[PDB]
Design an enzyme around this catalytic site. Structure first.
Site, PDB file in Angstrom:
ATOM      1  N   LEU A  84       0.793  -1.230   0.000  1.00 29.27           N
ATOM      2  CA  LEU A  84       0.000   0.000   0.000  1.00 29.27           C
ATOM      3  C   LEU A  84       0.823   1.277   0.000  1.00 29.27           C
ATOM      4  CD1 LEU A  84      -2.259  -1.205   2.963  1.00 29.27           C
ATOM      5  CD2 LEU A  84      -2.670  -1.595   0.475  1.00 29.27           C
ATOM      6  N   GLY A 131       6.634   4.467   3.954  1.00 33.01           N
ATOM      7  CA  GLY A 131       7.045   5.696   4.594  1.00 33.01           C
ATOM      8  C   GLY A 131       8.526   5.697   4.927  1.00 33.01           C
ATOM      9  N   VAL A 176       4.242  -0.789   4.038  1.00 31.18           N
ATOM     10  CA  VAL A 176       2.901  -1.099   4.507  1.00 31.18           C
ATOM     11  C   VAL A 176       2.203  -2.002   3.504  1.00 31.18           C
ATOM     12  CG1 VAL A 176       0.682  -0.162   5.113  1.00 31.18           C
ATOM     13  CG2 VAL A 176       2.733   0.987   5.851  1.00 31.18           C
ATOM     14  N   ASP A 202       3.467  13.843  15.890  1.00 32.77           N
ATOM     15  CA  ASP A 202       3.582  13.744  14.438  1.00 32.77           C
ATOM     16  C   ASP A 202       2.194  13.844  13.809  1.00 32.77           C
ATOM     17  OD1 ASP A 202       4.572  11.330  11.914  1.00 32.77           O
ATOM     18  OD2 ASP A 202       4.960  13.485  11.958  1.00 32.77           O
TER      19      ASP A 202
HETATM   20  N1  LIG Z   1       1.280   4.353   7.008  1.00 38.27           N
HETATM   21  C1  LIG Z   1       0.695   4.906   5.952  1.00 38.27           C
HETATM   22  O1  LIG Z   1       0.352   6.096   5.923  1.00 38.27           O
HETATM   23  C2  LIG Z   1       0.427   3.998   4.768  1.00 38.27           C
HETATM   24  C3  LIG Z   1      -0.991   3.511   4.748  1.00 38.27           C
HETATM   25  C4  LIG Z   1      -1.881   3.602   3.718  1.00 38.27           C
HETATM   26  N2  LIG Z   1      -3.119   3.169   4.121  1.00 38.27           N
HETATM   27  C5  LIG Z   1      -3.051   2.782   5.436  1.00 38.27           C
HETATM   28  C6  LIG Z   1      -4.032   2.296   6.293  1.00 38.27           C
HETATM   29  C7  LIG Z   1      -3.689   1.998   7.603  1.00 38.27           C
HETATM   30  C8  LIG Z   1      -2.381   2.191   8.028  1.00 38.27           C
HETATM   31 CL1  LIG Z   1      -1.960   1.802   9.674  1.00 38.27          CL
HETATM   32  C9  LIG Z   1      -1.396   2.674   7.187  1.00 38.27           C
HETATM   33  C10 LIG Z   1      -1.725   2.980   5.868  1.00 38.27           C
END
Ligand SMILES: NC(=O)Cc1c[nH]c2ccc(Cl)cc12
Ligand SMILES: NC(=O)Cc1c[nH]c2ccc(Cl)cc12
Length: 330
Positions: A44, A47, A52, A155
């Site tokens: 997904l 970072g 992720v 953050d």
């Molecule tokens: N860490 C992020 O910003 C990536 C990310 C995209 N979609 C998410 C949905 C849930 C979580 Cl914990 C993280 C993500």
């Protein structure tokens, strides 16, 4: 001789009246899980500190989000885990479902409850005035909870606010920068993203507290209601303070520096200059007016203050009339 000390106005001592194990995260023993409970479905994002993945729990086909940590020091991982465990079940906090370790590569990986879609690319775009109020109130629920549990998020920014606009739900995520508040403790100022750092971080005042997260929330709200992201667009840490000063004025800046007897990096002695405090109307134009109101500007003014001591707390923020319509609607 040195900087004048500081204490949080609220929740000052909540961590002292806890058992030591609640905040002494260095002593926390991690309860690992079986990473072979899970298969990765697709990536997904990635970072600064982790990649992720969508993933599936094969024992009970439950759908899940997996955050594979880039290598960090063991103590920061124990911090994040402990904070996530302490906050589990609180309002609009991401739920930590598990924590696993690759047997071969030895990398830790946190496992979370599924949520989808981010605040970016839908932020200063599709939300109405009422949406912004509603979602801001949901963020405040999270901040007030975690502060009342003795925890600074450090953050707060749109990338760390997962909104699922279909079901009107919100989660505050990525607690890897969070810390426990202890009266008198000096924290690292190299936290948060450039555009969201509070004046205390920029001037290197280390005895800060929860009110740091309220500066960031104010940054988020300014960009949404003015449709100007980021609101303070600094070139770097020193210029970031200049950009705030060109809006908030230098008078209150040097007032804050003197009240706390802050040593200003000589680097600053030339770029800050002299700047009047601007009225918020300067940022209103035809494209953003439908999101601006006297209530919103008043609320914003009381978040974006140099003196961290004088910002609205999260509970105070939720009592502001910007949220009267939201509160009556639940
Ligand atoms: N860490 C992020 O910003 C990536 C990310 C995209 N979609 C998410 C949905 C849930 C979580 Cl914990 C993280 C993500
Ligand atoms: N069965 C596995 O080990 C798949 C896998 C590879 N890398 C991971 C990282 C985290 C999680 Cl939960 C699962 C995996």
């Amino acid at each position: 001789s040195g900087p004048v000390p500081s204490r949080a106005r609220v929740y000052t001592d909540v961590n002292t009246h806890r058992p030591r194990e609640y905040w002494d995260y260095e002593s926390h023993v991690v309860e690992w899980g079986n990473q072979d409970d899970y298969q990765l479905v697709r990536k997904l994002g990635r970072g600064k500190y982790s990649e992720v993945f969508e993933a599936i729990n094969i024992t009970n086909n439950e759908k899940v989000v997996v955050k594979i940590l880039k290598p960090v020091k063991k103590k920061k991982i124990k911090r994040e885990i402990k904070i996530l465990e302490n906050l589990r079940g609180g309002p609009n906090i991401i739920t930590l479902a598990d924590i696993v370790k690759d047997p071969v590569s030895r990398t830790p990986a946190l496992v979370f409850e599924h949520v989808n879609n981010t605040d970016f690319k839908q932020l200063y775009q599709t939300l109405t005035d009422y949406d912004i109020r509603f979602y801001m109130y949901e963020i405040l629920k999270a901040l007030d909870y975690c502060h009342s549990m003795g925890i600074m998020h450090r953050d707060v920014k749109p990338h760390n606010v997962m909104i699922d606009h279909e079901h009107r739900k919100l989660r505050l995520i990525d607690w890897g920068l969070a810390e426990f508040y202890h009266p008198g403790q000096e924290y690292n100022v190299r936290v948060a993203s450039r555009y969201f750092k509070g004046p205390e971080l920029l001037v290197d005042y280390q005895m800060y507290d929860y009110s740091l997260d309220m500066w960031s929330l104010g940054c988020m709200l300014a960009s949404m209601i003015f449709r100007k992201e980021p609101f303070f667009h600094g070139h770097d840490n020193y210029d970031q303070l200049v950009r705030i000063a060109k809006v908030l004025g230098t008078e209150d800046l040097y007032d804050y520096i003197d009240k706390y007897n802050i040593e200003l990096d000589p680097r600053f002695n030339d770029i800050l200059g002299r700047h009047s405090r601007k009225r918020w109307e300067r940022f209103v134009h035809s494209e953003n007016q439908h999101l601006v109101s006297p209530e919103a500007l008043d609320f914003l003014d009381k978040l974006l203050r140099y003196d961290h001591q004088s910002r609205l707390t999260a509970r105070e923020a939720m009592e502001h009339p910007y949220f009267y319509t939201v509160v009556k609607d639940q």
